[PDB]
Amino acid sequence: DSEAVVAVDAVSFTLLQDQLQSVLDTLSEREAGVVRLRFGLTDGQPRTLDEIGQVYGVTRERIRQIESKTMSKLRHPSRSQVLRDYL
Amino acid sequence: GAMLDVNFFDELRIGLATAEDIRQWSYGEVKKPETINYRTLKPEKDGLFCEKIFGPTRDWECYCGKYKRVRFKGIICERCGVEVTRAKVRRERMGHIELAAPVTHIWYFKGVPSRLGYLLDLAPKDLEKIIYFAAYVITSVDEEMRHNELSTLEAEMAVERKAVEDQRDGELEARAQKLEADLAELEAEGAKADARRKVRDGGEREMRQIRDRAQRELDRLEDIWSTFTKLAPKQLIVDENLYRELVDRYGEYFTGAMGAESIQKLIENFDIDAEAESLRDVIRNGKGQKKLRALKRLKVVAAFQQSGNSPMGMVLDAVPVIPPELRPMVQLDGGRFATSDLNDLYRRVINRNNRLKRLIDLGAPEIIVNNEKRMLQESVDALFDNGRRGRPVTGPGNRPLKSLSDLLKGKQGRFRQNLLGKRVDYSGRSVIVVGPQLKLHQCGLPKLMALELFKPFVMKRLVDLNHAQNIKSAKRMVERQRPQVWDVLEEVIAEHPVLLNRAPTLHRLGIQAFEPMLVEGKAIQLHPLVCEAFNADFDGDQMAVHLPLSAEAQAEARILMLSSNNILSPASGRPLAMPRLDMVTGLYYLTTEVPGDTGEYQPASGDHPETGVYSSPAEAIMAADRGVLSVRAKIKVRLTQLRPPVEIEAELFGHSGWQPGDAWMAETTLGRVMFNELLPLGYPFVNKQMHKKVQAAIINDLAERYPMIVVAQTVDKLKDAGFYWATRSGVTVSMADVLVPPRKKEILDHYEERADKVEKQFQRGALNHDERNEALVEIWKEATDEVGQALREHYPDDNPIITIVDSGATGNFTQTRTLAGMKGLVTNPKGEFIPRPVKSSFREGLTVLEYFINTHGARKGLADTALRTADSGYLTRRLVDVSQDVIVREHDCQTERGIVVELAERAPDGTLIRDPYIETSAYARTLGTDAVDEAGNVIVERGQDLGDPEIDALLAAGITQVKVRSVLTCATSTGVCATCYGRSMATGKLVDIGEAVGIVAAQSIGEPGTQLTMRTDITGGLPRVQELFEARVPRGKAPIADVTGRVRLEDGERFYKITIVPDDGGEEVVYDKISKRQRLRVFKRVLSDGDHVEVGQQLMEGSADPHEVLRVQGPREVQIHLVREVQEVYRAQGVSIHDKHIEVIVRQMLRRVTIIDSGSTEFLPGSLIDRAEFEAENRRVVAEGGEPAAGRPVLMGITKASLATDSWLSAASFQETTRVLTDAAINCRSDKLNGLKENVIIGKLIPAGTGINRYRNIAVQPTEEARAAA
DNA sequence: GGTCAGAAAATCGGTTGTGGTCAGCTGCTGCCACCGGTTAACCTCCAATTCTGCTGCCAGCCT
DNA sequence: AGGCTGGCAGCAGAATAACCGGTGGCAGCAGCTGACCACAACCGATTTTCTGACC
Ligand SMILES: [Mg+2]
């Protein structure tokens, strides 16, 4: 059955979600909410840039600048090693 | 009932599905015979695989693509139609097919007895002709319109026949005028006298055939009127022309039809209550064939009457469709497809149904439409059961397709291939080798298998020790086998048992749980003392290793199933971890004594003292390490740490020699001292020679007096010393150690003369062709025995071959006789003895003809041993299925019943001789009443275990009978009690209150197959056991007496005839056709005329049938008879089974009674009901008005008593799956899941062992003082 | 030998500006895949054994 | 005069070759977009905090 649950990818996916929740929780609240709403980690629905800007009360260029800075912060190795081994 | 299948079960009720249940299960109607589009591979709309009906293929992803998230859940895509949910609902959703004409179920029409035929009272050959479109059937008829139109229509019929007669007399007058014209034109022509009259004779012959044709049409009209005047429902009409004539002349007054629609109309016009009243009136009044027919109809009519079922579910309007994940279409590697043969059957049904809808809505003649309906009926029949009526539907290559019923039956069905035996994870195989340095609780496990078995544990541990960062890198490290993983693997393998199992698993000691350790290699190193339990050689045999995961499973494998907790065999109680053959040769050499060896004690004096004594076994061992003392020479040591035997102890120290300290002198060898240092400290000094029976007695005494850890450690020490002294024993085989006897030529000549004289007398003609065969066979049997005796008295006592045989290690003496001496006689493909014989031994070398003769018997023995294991497996299967519901439920039934036990019958001169079969009849069962001796006190009180000191005390006090307590008289309702079972043979204590004693009994009986040889027309091997447990009538059926009296022997032609004259002046009883070969029975004297016989004396040699001895001498004497006849098959081959393992099977045959008089309560005569249900009904019914139903005991075999059970789920998985399911459906039977095989199927805890409520609800908490002190 | 306006830093954030950029249809247009109908010399009936229970059948006392 | 009882006999079942018309799908692609990144600059306070001179 070449399309079954491989029983180690499921537990690896659960540990990946746990580690991603940890690394996202070690940030600022506004940046973490922006990243979650941008990549759809809340409820599986990705949100638009103007939608995040509307619900957080700032402009879209401010939102995308905060997103770029937060993506740099996550790309930094100090936060990035424990997720670098997963991929 | 709920259908979510969460584990809250109480019942599992099976019924008969109606059409309004089928179109309430279904999720939509499949109406095209399409499966998958050929180019894009997506499931077609309204086909057999349609996503709108059976759910979507992709998880939370609809078809057209409009909704694709978990956010949309349970929504219906308004363009395409598929709802959005998981893709595992394609194994849980069914569809249905709407048939354009009704179709009968094949199960309720074809399988004998035909339930439709019994319900409608139609013969099967007159029912197949209806439902397969060959004969019409009158569904209904009018009565009063028929009554007055009888007069009017017979007036019209007489008028029509009168007009026919008017045309007939027109024919008469026309032929008369034609003959008168022939008279006018032939009365004046001059010709011959007959030629002028042969034309008139031809005209009269034409008149004769005209009136013959008139008779033919008048008989046709008479037949039409007769079959109208005798018209009734359920009456077949063949001759479509005749039915057509009845239809167009008499279109009123009746309705007729043809097929499953007519069957449905007859089922609708049917009154079950009035039919049942008529049937019960017949069974109350009439007799014979009509009464038997009414009973067999009343079975299914009462089944349809008592419940809320209706008979209308036997015809169908909507076939259901199995979900598309159970008949998958799977694409292989490279575009090859694979379907599951059900799509062809469903496609044929859907094609023929669509074509029938087209023909009906078009308007077609009856021949075409009836052929289409017959084709649709045959398609649905081939779907439900292929190859039941006619030819099986074949695929490509001419193999029959696999229909729905073929998924369920046989060894390849669901019930036997996937529900009872499954493949498992965490398992592996290898090939076993011998591990003689291991302890008894250890096994060697190769590291490459142990890594793959313990991979998740080692992944967790090497993540936690920071050798890796996560599970993915840890798995990569394990699969690349980097060298940290062995240091982790040792620490995760410490103290974690595994189960080792070797197929076949004949008895319960074939699965045992060792504690593993790592071994550099690829072979599972096994201990050499568990090979007898596993039945394992090392010729390449393979063993399977499982692995317990949960805490309960590890506790079970550590406590219940550990290797050093199963020393004794559960069948007889003999030890199975006893040393065998190699340690036996070692210990026999160590403890034997040679007279006149080196350093022997000799009391010769006058000049010097004895010079044989020693001051300690340390000094003796030093002298034996020098070249002075042999191990097997008689000395006088001075022991200080070995407990003396009882006589020397009572002589020297009297009572309390505290054997750590005291000193005493023993005149033994040194080998016996070194043997007794292995036994425990309190065990007395043995001082014997260790034959294998002596070692078995020592280990049995140890297991009954000491703890099991002491027995296990002692058994390991015996193994070590046995191997070490087996090496130094000088046991080798050479060609000079096989000595031939020196008188074999003289013995063979002396018997050759007698054989030559017998053959010369046959050539003279004084004896026929068979008497010389018997004489030659007897002569050569005597010659074989004489050669064996000469060999036995010629061989020295210290030969290697005779030491191996005499120490009980291996072999018997007949193998030594054929090795040196004489092979003897040999068999035939028929089985008789070829009277040649084989006069050469395998040391001298057989010749060409003797070798070719010997090959017959050798190959027949090999083929018989191939067959006998399958036969024993089948017998064990049936015994397990009968006795699966005998588990221990209480501690005391508290009855006062019990059987009697023979216990060392009296001698004629006057003394007590011990009965030989006392270790399998009287040991290890509780006393029922007290033992009182010849107006005396109690010797053994009631309730004792009756072991060896109790038996010795009883035989010393001089009593012969005891009333012992047995499971045939256990008075609990469900399962035996525990004091009635006695001690468990495998532990030595009383049996526990969850034990599965029925399965232990069945495996203990069925395991000594493949050592029950038949012979060399009474059966005497394995088929003697099968025809006892099945309770068949035997082959050599010897009759028994029916009343005490005098035998009046009569001798007819070539055989006998016996009529017993009763003493009480009763009716004479006659047995007539008792054949020639049955010789008369001999007791004490041959049965002569005028002899005296008892009520149950067997009259001839052979085998009494067990039904007859039950009918004469009550239910007790058939329990004596069945146990005695089974045990004489096992005792002939030296196999010990305790009798409490046969009484568990025997008590499960006599559970039921047969009804002779119904009385007033719902019990049809000839039926078999349980006795506990019978007596509970009689107490309820004869209260407030006495109408007791009368019942007789019955004895039924182990195949009827396991199909007539109370659960339809345990019965269907045994045997006859189609027949068991097809009448559990009619009765609307409910299963309660109380069994031990129903719980295995549905996957919950069995109700025996640690799965009962006494043990499963234990509350464990720390105590008060240890909670405080931490 | 000290107080007040201006200049000069990131900093958080709004504007804004256009410069592509990608998709979202949208015709639409050709085409291609698929379903349905039609063909008028004549020639008109298929390719092993073992056991248990059930039913059909024929003589034969009984009325 | 037949009938319904009796074995007796025989059998099912289980285990071990093209045209024409039409119609809807479909893929390929210029061609409106129109929302959207997206750099990239440019300012709007903002706060600090020197910088510069003032008397
Ligand atoms: Mg072997």
Ligand SMILES: [Zn+2]
């Ligand atoms: Zn959809």
Ligand SMILES: [Zn+2]
């Ligand atoms: Zn009991």
